[PDB]
Paper text:
FcRn facilitates new-born humoral immunity by regulating Immunoglobulin (IgG) transport across the epithelium. In addition, it has been shown to bind to IgG and Human Serum Albumin (HSA) at nonoverlapping sites in a pH-dependent manner. Existing as a heterodimer composed of β2-microglobulin (β2m) and a membrane-anchored α-chain, FcRn is homologous to the class I major histocompatibility complex (MHC1). FcRn has been proposed as a drug target in the treatment of autoimmune diseases, in which pathogenic autoantibodies are detrimental to health.
Residue numbers in the entry:
A (entry chain A): 4 to 268
B (entry chain B): 1 to 99
The structure:
């Protein structure tokens, strides 16, 4: 089922005008929350701006993230030295098959996973000396472990359930992709065929090529977001010059009732 | 650790000459998070460019979307220019309208 996940980052020497600490919050693949240490306020994103919330919703998100801001910045002092450092955290929860919450609490230092929070013991830990140093500093801070436990075991699933109830339609959004299949010349004797899927949601999507109705492979491709949180994808196949018209592309996506055949332009 | 950015350039909607649209430059998979991105129109830096929040994927690598409103034409060429510490010089990726 659907995850609520906070992506937290601190940097020890932010570029001027940029935040030392910022957070994005995600309900599955769409962002609902933004926070940075320069504004110091948690804010809704996209359609979640229009969500009907409890009267204290966003002030409590702000309260929690200001606390995590202080912790992340304390982590650099525990390491000492010139740095620079990047500290990231992935904190959140998802509801499990029997309608209970499953927590996530992992951290990375300079792009490398190095620490987690153990919810059974209420302690941060990891193998590297940087993990031991930061964990000890956090562990020695009054109520820090307690607030981390509450955040993951109570606040997160409560928020997730509230958004499932108040924003169900936002989460069930199904926008089918606009499809195009086009060929361009390549090296001598070859063309590149590209099947492209525009402005769709959710991100799960399959593109396949057929040659005279027979399976011709997935091709090679990529995918990415648009500014509104919908998505874009393409996949490309190298084919012999003059043979392009024998090919089509098939797309599977939840916004369509059936797989859709896309013919060359 | 350092990771070099992957760069993708595509429009929000299928490109149609004379129809308003958005051009995206999606930069992902990079570390550390400091990155510089410009959209270019026939080589000239575009002034009115917005960007999403710097976020990161399950493998901790960062990603970012830059976008600008534009109206494609037959002859105008667009590109994305990216600088990052992993790059010995700025990388320029041309917009392929098919992509």
């Amino acid at each position: 089922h659907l995850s609520l996940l906070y992506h937290l980052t601190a940097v020890s020497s932010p570029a001027p005008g940029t935040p030392a600490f910022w957070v994005s919050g995600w309900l599955g693949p769409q962002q609902y929350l933004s926070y940075n240490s320069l504004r110091g306020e948690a804010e809704p994103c996209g359609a979640w701006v229009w969500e009907n919330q409890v009267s204290w919703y966003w002030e409590k998100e702000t309260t929690d993230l200001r606390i995590k801001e202080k912790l992340f910045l304390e982590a650099f002092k525990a390491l000492g030295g010139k740095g620079p450092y990047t500290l990231q955290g992935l904190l959140g929860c998802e509801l499990g098959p029997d309608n209970t919450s499953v927590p996530t609490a992992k951290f990375a230092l300079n792009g490398e996973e190095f620490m987690n929070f153990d919810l059974k013991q209420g302690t941060w830990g990891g193998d590297w000396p940087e993990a031991l140093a930061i964990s000890q500093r956090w562990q020695q801070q009054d109520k820090a472990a307690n607030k981390e436990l509450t955040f993951l075991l109570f606040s997160c699933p409560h928020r997730l359930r509230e958004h499932l109830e108040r924003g169900r339609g936002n989460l069930e959004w199904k926008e089918p992709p606009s499809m195009r299949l086009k060929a361009r010349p390549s090296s001598p004797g070859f063309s590149v065929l590209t099947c492209s899927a525009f402005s769709f949601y959710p991100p799960e999507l399959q593109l396949r090529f057929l040659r005279n109705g027979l399976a011709a492979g997935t091709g090679q491709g990529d995918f990415g977001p648009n500014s509104d949180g919908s998505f874009h994808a393409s996949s490309s196949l190298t084919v012999k010059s003059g043979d392009e018209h024998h090919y089509c592309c098939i797309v599977q996506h939840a916004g369509l009732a059936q797989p859709l055949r896309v013919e060359l332009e | 650790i350092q990771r070099t950015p992957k760069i993708q350039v595509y429009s929000r909607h299928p490109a149609e000459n004379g129809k308003s649209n958005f051009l995206n430059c999606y930069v992902s998979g990079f570390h550390p998070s400091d990155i510089e991105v410009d959209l270019l129109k026939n080589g000239e830096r575009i002034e009115k460019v917005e960007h999403s929040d710097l976020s990161f994927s399950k493998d901790w690598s960062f990603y970012l979307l830059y976008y600008t409103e534009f109206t494609p034409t037959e002859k105008d060429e667009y590109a994305c220019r990216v600088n990052h510490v992993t790059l010995s010089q700025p990388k320029i990726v041309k917009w392929d309208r098919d992509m």
